[PDB]
C-alpha cells in the first residue's frame, strides 16, 4: 500500500535519472560549441556555485530531520523542519534565477552560442525540478497542518524525501561536469 507507492516513485526517479543523463550527454557534445562567444571560464563564478551547492546540501539534511520527526509523533516539528528546507531550496532557486538573469541581460542567453543552449537546458531542467519539488513541499505542508501525520501524509513525506535527495545527487553531477570541469 504505502510501500508500493514509495517503490513506484523510486522507479520514476530512475527514469528521471535517465532524463538527466541525456542532458549531460548533450552538454558534453556541445560544451566546445561556442560560436565565438564565452566559454565556461569566462562565465562561471565559482564562489557563487559554492554557495548554491551548500544551500542544496543544507536542504538535504533539513529534510532528513523532517523525516526523523515523522518517525516520532511530533507533527509540529515536521512542519518546522519543512519550513527551513523550503527556505534553502528557495534560496537555491533565487540564485539560479539571478545567474540566468545576468547572462540573458548581458547577451549570453540560450539563443547565442549553442554551448549556452546546453548550459541553460541542464541547469534550467534541474531548477525546474527544484521548483516542482518546492511546490510539492508547500502542498504537503498545508496537508499536514490540516490533517496531521496520517498514513497518506506519511507516505507523501517519504516520496518527497526520495525526490528531494535525488535533486542533490543530480547537482553533484552538475557542479562537477559543468562548473568545476568548465572552470579548470
Amino acid at each position: 500500500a504505502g510501500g508500493t507507492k514509495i517503490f513506484g516513485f523510486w522507479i520514476y526517479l530512475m527514469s528521471d535519472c535517465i532524463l538527466f543523463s541525456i542532458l549531460f550527454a548533450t552538454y558534453a557534445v556541445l560544451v566546445n560549441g561556442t560560436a565565438g562567444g564565452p566559454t565556461g571560464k569566462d562565465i562561471f563564478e565559482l564562489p557563487f556555485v559554492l554557495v548554491e551547492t551548500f544551500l542544496l546540501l543544507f536542504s538535504s539534511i533539513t529534510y532528513g530531520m523532517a523525516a526523523i520527526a515523522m518517525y516520532k509523533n511530533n507533527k509540529s516539528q515536521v512542519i518546522s523542519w519543512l519550513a527551513l528546507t523550503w527556505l534553502f531550496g528557495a534560496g537555491f532557486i533565487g540564485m539560479e534565477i539571478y545567474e540566468f538573469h545576468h547572462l540573458i541581460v548581458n547577451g549570453m542567453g540560450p539563443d547565442r552560442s549553442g554551448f549556452l543552449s546546453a548550459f541553460f537546458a541542464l541547469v534550467g531542467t534541474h531548477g525546474l525540478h527544484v521548483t516542482s519539488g518546492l511546490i510539492w513541499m508547500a502542498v504537503l505542508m498545508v496537508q499536514i497542518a490540516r490533517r496531521g501525520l496520517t498514513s497518506t501524509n506519511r507516505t507523501r513525506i517519504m516520496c518527497l524525501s526520495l525526490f528531494w535527495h535525488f535533486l542533490d545527487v543530480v547537482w553533484i553531477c552538475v557542479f562537477t561536469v559543468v562548473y568545476l570541469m568548465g572552470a579548470m
Partner: protein, 97 residues
Amino acid sequence: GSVKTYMTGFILSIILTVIPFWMVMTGAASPAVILGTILAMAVVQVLVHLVCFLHMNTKSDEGWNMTAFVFTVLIIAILVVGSIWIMWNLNYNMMMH
C-alpha cells in the same frame, strides 16, 4: 541514532565539496590530478548520499530498489559513453582532411 547517519553523511559531503572547489579556485599545479580527484570525489559523494540520505539497501524490496538502481547506472553508462564515443568519431570525421 538515525541522526548519526544523517550527520556523518552531511559532514562527509561538506568535505567532499570543499576539496574539489578549493583545487580549481587555487590551481594545484596539475590539471590531471585535479580532474582525477574531482571525478573521484563526485562519485564518492554520490555514494554517500545514496547510503546516508536515500538509504540504499540490498534487502529493501526483496532485492529490488537496488537492482533497479544498478540497471539504470548501466543504461546511463551505455547511453552517455556510447553517445560520446559515437559523436567523437562523427566529429573527427566530417572535417576538412
